[PDB]
């Protein structure tokens, strides 16, 4: 008689506005499984360029993250860096630290330096301080954020 | 009225210049349409329509080339499958 009625998730819809992916329509039931995960839900995911694999959490998850490299319109291009997780206090953001040696020509010796960078982390990753991450350059996402986490080792 | 000569109704003003006979000044008439201008207007449309027709010909030749290559590939596949069937 009538089509079945879905229900709100209540574990991801905890904001003032309805959270949704802009790439697919969750209300369309089509005969082709173009964008369908193992659970049968409609979910959009893609492969980023270089030799990086899309995590299974991204394909089979339920978060939204309109800033995610694997499930949104953010594109990775530029340079690739590695660092050490320094702090994970902000929401969906972490601070990584890069340590390097600088060469002083007059004394023929090295000295230690460091630099702090703030990056965006998708919910498919769960880094902790002391971990090692690989990040890739993207378009400006905030006042100080220019990188996205691609892999946690 | 329409289709009436206008080339001699234009007035001429006499300028009495010393040392020679008076010059007569008449304006140049604008928007005078002759047979050469009519042919010039009509050539533009026929040249334009030939350009779009020769572009349709170029598209047809490209489509024929694409179709011929796919026909050959299907024929080769059918021959392989046909040979496999009769070798059973």
């Amino acid at each position: 008689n009538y089509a079945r009625t879905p229900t709100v998730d209540l574990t991801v819809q905890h904001e003032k506005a309805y959270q949704r992916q802009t790439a697919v329509n969750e209300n369309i039931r089509t005969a082709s499984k173009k964008h369908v995960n193992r659970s049968g839900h409609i979910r959009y995911s893609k492969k980023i360029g270089l030799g990086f694999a899309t995590p299974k959490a991204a394909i089979n998850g339920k978060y939204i993250d309109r800033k995610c490299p694997f499930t949104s319109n953010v594109s990775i291009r530029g340079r690739i860096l590695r660092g050490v997780v320094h702090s994970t206090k902000m929401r969906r953001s972490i601070v990584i630290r890069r340590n390097y040696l600088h060469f002083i020509r007059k004394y023929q010796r090295y000295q230690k330096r460091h630099r702090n960078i703030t990056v965006h982390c998708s919910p498919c990753f769960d880094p902790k301080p002391g971990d090692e991450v690989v990040v890739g350059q993207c378009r400006p996402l905030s006042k100080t954020i220019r990188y996205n986490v691609l892999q946690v080792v | 009225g329409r289709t009436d000569d206008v080339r001699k109704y234009v007035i001429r003003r006499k300028v009495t210049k010393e040392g020679k006979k008076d010059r007569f000044k008449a304006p140049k008439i604008q928007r005078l349409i002759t047979s050469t201008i009519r042919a010039r207007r009509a050539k533009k449309v026929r040249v334009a329509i030939d350009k779009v027709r020769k572009s349709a010909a170029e598209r047809r030749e490209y489509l024929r080339l694409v179709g011929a290559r796919r026909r050959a590939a299907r024929q080769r596949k059918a021959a392989r499958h046909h040979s496999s069937r009769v070798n059973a």
């Binding site: 008689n1 009538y2 089509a3 009625t5 879905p6 229900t7 709100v8 998730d9 819809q13 904001e15 003032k16 506005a17 309805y18 949704r20 329509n25 969750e26 209300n27 369309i28 006042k143 100080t144 | -």
Partner: protein, 187 residues
């Protein structure tokens, strides 16, 4: 005037940046349109590189899409009922992107009758159209919330265009869990 540069901002260290050079035309901003709801009124703006932007002021109609049926109709907006930014926008009746509005449902009722033969003029149809209706209705199902709203005379939709940039108020009807999410808030 208004600028969009980072020169007036503090550094991450908290220090103050000493500004040399003046303000450039390439980084200007402009005053917001603040589109209201009413008889149509627009104002052209000459943007960079030529080209014209249209400022929406008091729009009242647009094209609204029925996503499930992949159609659209031209309908008149009746009122604004919700806004995720602040209640002040709902109170002042401001049309912006993602605003929740209601529409008159008359065009969508007419389309449903002429496509499926169900009336929420039908009996005067050709036999081959009647046969086509039976096929379409064979494996088509409407949902509770949509059928109730179409009978009532209004249904909810969200604005999909940016009225202050293009001067158009277009949107999509609400369906699925999105309809349930906003119905519970509107209670």
């Amino acid at each position: 005037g208004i600028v969009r540069s980072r020169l007036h901002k503090r550094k991450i260290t908290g220090g103050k940046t000493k500004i040399h050079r003046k303000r450039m035309k390439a980084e200007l901003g402009r005053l917001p349109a603040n589109t209201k709801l009413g008889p149509r009124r627009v104002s052209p703006v000459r943007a960079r590189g030529g080209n014209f932007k249209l400022r929406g002021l008091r729009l009242d109609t647009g094209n609204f899409a029925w996503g499930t049926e992949a159609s659209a109709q031209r309908a008149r907006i009746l009122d604004v009922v919700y806004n995720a930014t602040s209640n002040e926008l709902v109170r002042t009746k401001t049309l912006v992107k993602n605003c929740i509005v209601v529409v008159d449902a008359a065009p969508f009722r007419l389309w449903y009758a002429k496509h499926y033969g169900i009336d929420l003029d039908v009996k005067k149809a050709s036999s081959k159209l009647k046969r086509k209706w039976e096929y379409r209705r064979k494996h088509h199902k409407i949902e509770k919330a949509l059928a109730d709203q179409l009978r009532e005379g209004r249904l909810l939709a969200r604005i999909t265009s940016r009225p202050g940039q293009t001067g158009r108020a277009d949107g999509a009807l609400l369906e699925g869990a999105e309809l349930q999410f906003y119905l519970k808030k509107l209670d």
